[PDB]
Design a protein around this ligand. Structure first.
Ligand code: NDP
Ligand code: NDP
Ligand code: NDP
Ligand code: NDP
Lengths: 263, 263, 263, 263
């Protein structure tokens, strides 16, 4: 199936590893030029190198904290200088939480609000005008199954991802007049490095069988009884931002292996 | 993006015209063999001929009423004998309604229950064993946006489509152990023959401006302010049934131009 | 808080035991006259006597199958005969299922369709006219948490209850012009006879700790870690049918001790 | 119906006028003592006098900004000093927004986050321990129908009310172990002074018929074709915080005259 995004410019936040890198490889595979965004400079250089070598597309690196207005303004200025504007924006930067409401500090709340919601708000403000000038585009928000089905141990994550899923919906209605399609993707269990680090930490005193720990997670949560690969998730991001998904507007698409328990 | 379904067997109910035909064309393009199912045999021939002539695939026609157990049995036996079993089943046969709860006959409720729900129950019972034996597969239920956001004039449609959406999710959990992935797609406004028929009928005594009538429907209901083409929609069905959507299980995916008013 | 329903006529289907009898007692307490509806004549006669004797309200018994048109007709005609019309209607008759989609007979699908969906359809058709003539009224559909969050073992129950929940909403918009407010209640785990019966059955060969079994069910499904009593749930049915809930139209209200896993 | 809250202490934020004052009167009518919280000292002082005279319960005034940590600490301190703790907490303080995402300043996103979400986080942290110590209680969050069905003109409101609804759910699962029941209420159109102010402003130049403007709003959005009264809404607040709603946990209850367009 032709995706029709050859030569389009795709900005992916949090794209030096895990889901965000797999997303960047999937767009690169389809001929899209890539803007990679993350904090660690070295991992970012590796990712760019590998994308260029494997896929022969242009890759720009922006090494900034997207949870800050300065960081966002640098992404916007770098995209403008190198490419003129973006055709695709994937908001993927984000991270799990771990607290009780009774004990969490206000600053922790603030931090996930800036990272999960304010980054998407500021990137929409900064990139929509260029995308509009280029004739339209696609914006995706990677929220989470937690945005609707909260996990008990991460209330701040649940709340901020919930806010992000609403944000995506409100942006979709505001920019569709610009021929800009906005949608949300809500992933289930996706096997990424932090899951492995967590599985090892939690099994350190009972045998170290981190793979069995992950298998029990999938057994308890997903009818599919396994985690997804980042690559299988990325496919959906690429599809939704392609010329083949032109009637998707303001929707939330779950990619979750049966984990959502309700209709 | 490679779909990986070349040479797979796709059964599409309601595929002699409109959306079902566009879906069959989308699968045929990707090299899938096609079983077309509809009642009227004239249009089934014309569609089948056009698919073989345009895409070079095998097409089996089954002219039956899928709202009957005998019709479904015929489809199951045609697939078994011609192909062994199906890899893909798309439940698409269905039709709008138009009544009030206070006036509609019990027999009309029963008609839509058979067509929208029991056809899918019976096809799953009949085709899942062969699909299992082939190593897995994909099943899609075309419900509608109305399965969650009911349109005032068609309560029977709304109820039976809601029931269909729940069926899809329950079948999803039952059969994922067989590597069979079941999902639902909920389309918004899709420009099909019946819409154009209706527009022309509703404007016959006031100017015959059927295009104007369709445009006001779009403006009323969809932020994108147009209907989808059946081809735009077909893409989603093709993607969901492909080797690129292998983590989609028990989900309901809206394709609606913004029409869904809630999160 | 005054419910303002003294002297009103409440029809409760499935009201010789369990949740239905608790709902009838809740209405009786507030001085409503009661139409009790259930199949077993003596259980119904006994429920009627005890309501009349505890609460001093009028009680009419209609011993019929509400899953049949003739049974619904008998209810409508006894209401008309004894009271003129109903002010309140609670669709409560229903029962659990237990099957796989691969194995269940079409006839079983049919039975649950008749009992969960068509009874409410036919009772709305039969009772709305008299309710309208009395100046308005309230109708409730007792669906289930399973209407949105399906239980693995009872797909027919899940599909038919989801259908009921949609019916409730579509009826809501049709009859609000008559000052009739229709809403749905979705209960979680409610301790009824069948629950205790099932706990005793499933523990007959392992120790007969039926209390242990129910506790584990509650522990698995509900954050509050107990079943509701039928009387706790009844309060909500009485409130929603009262002069204090005059802005509730077309809603679904969960009463589930935390069991719903999503927003 | 006995609510069983006579002598309990209910804290209501934003209760010097509108919905919060109606809720405070509703608890008062039921014999609950009242903690009134709002910024404007004058309106608060008189709302307090008028409640005591009219209902003969105790009334504590706390004139603070609950969007600030200092404001919340003053509430918690004054409740501790005057009553020991609270039995009931209603988070009601909040206000509409009005902007585009493209134009809104970061400061404005921040203000709505503090007011609609952080007020509830901070009041949960400050009041739950006293509520726990009293044997349990009830907490309500007044979010909005906009939490799931966004209004085009107030993206910040839609996003922060969505976050508040998720917060309510995450809190409910955390504190149910303390015998504290947390739920959310999502009102539709409720006739409060800002609606009237708005209807006048927007009719200033076309005839001044502010009532007909409100009627056109109700006609467009609500099948019941009128706004609710604050007193109408308040009944559901008092019910949910009463001893008659003991199985309601982590639910979202809409009170919206049919406004919600989906199931
Ligand atoms: N894994 C899972 O099971 C699921 C994940 N998700 C969502 O997917 C998204 C990606 O998660 P995943 O791939 O697991 O996470 P990883 O931790 O593997 O990847 C995070 C990426 O984002 C970058 N990043 C983190 N914070 C910032 C920041 N402030 N500014 C710029 N870049 C940042 C990281 O690089 P660096 O540290 O150098 O900044 C890294 O490239 C997240 O939004 C997550 O919530 C949703 C559902 C499930
Ligand atoms: N068009 C739209 O805006 C939307 C449509 N949908 C759904 O899409 C699906 C396809 O509809 P659409 O393309 O619009 O409609 P069409 O009328 O254009 O297509 C209906 C197809 O179903 C066949 N059909 C109808 N009843 C039966 C039956 N009992 N047995 C076998 N085939 C049958 C028809 O052929 P024949 O009569 O010859 O049997 C025809 O091929 C339906 O389920 C509809 O509810 C969902 C959302 C929006
Ligand atoms: N119990 C629970 O945990 C939950 C229950 N529900 C729903 O609550 C409702 C009542 O359930 P519950 O109290 O548990 O069940 P019970 O079996 O204890 O009560 C069911 C009532 O319905 C009557 N009934 C059943 N079939 C018919 C029929 N065809 N015609 C007329 N009356 C009938 C029964 O009497 P008779 O047999 O004499 O006809 C009985 O009085 C049902 O809709 C159920 O689906 C929803 C969620 C949870
Ligand atoms: N009216 C409607 O149609 C709907 C309203 N709602 C929600 O209902 C709630 C009540 O709104 P409504 O009654 O309409 O609004 P009003 O503006 O009429 O009342 C707001 C009350 O809250 C107080 N308040 C506002 N901000 C603060 C603050 N920062 N700290 C302390 N008190 C504050 C106000 O007093 P003061 O200004 O002196 O501080 C006033 O007493 C809100 O949460 C709103 O979002 C939900 C759905 C619909």
């Amino acid at each position: 199936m032709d995706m029709g995004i050859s030569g389009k410019v795709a900005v992916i936040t949090g794209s030096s590893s895990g889901i965000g890198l797999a997303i960047a490889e999937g767009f690169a595979k389809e001929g899209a030029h890539i803007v990679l965004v993350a904090r660690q400079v070295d991992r970012l250089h590796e990712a760019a190198r590998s994308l260029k070598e494997k896929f022969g597309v242009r890759v720009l690196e922006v090494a900034v904290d997207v949870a800050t207005p300065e960081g966002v303004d640098a992404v916007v200025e770098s995209v403008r200088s190198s490419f003129g504007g973006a055709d695709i924006l994937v908001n993927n930067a984000g991270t799990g939480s771990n607290e009780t409401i009774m004990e969490a500090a206000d600053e922790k709340w603030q931090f996930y609000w800036e990272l999960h919601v304010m980054a998407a708000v500021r990137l929409a403000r900064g990139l929509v005008p260029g995308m509009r000038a280029r004739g339209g585009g696609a914006i995706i928000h990677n929220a989470s199954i937690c945005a609707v089905q909260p996990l008990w141990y991460e209330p701040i994550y649940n709340v901020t991802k919930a806010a992000l899923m609403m944000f995506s919906k409100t942006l979709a209605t505001e920019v569709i007049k610009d021929n800009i399609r906005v949608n949300c993707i809500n992933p289930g269990l996706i096997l990424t490095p932090d899951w492995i680090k967590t599985a090892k930490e939690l099994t350190k005193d009972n045998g170290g069988d981190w793979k069995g720990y992950l298998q029990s997670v999938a057994d308890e949560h997903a009818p599919i009884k396994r985690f997804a690969s980042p690559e299988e998730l990325a496919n959906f991001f690429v599809f939704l931002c392609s010329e083949r998904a032109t009637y998707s507007v303001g929707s939330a698409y779950f990619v979750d292996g049966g984990m959502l328990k309700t209709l």
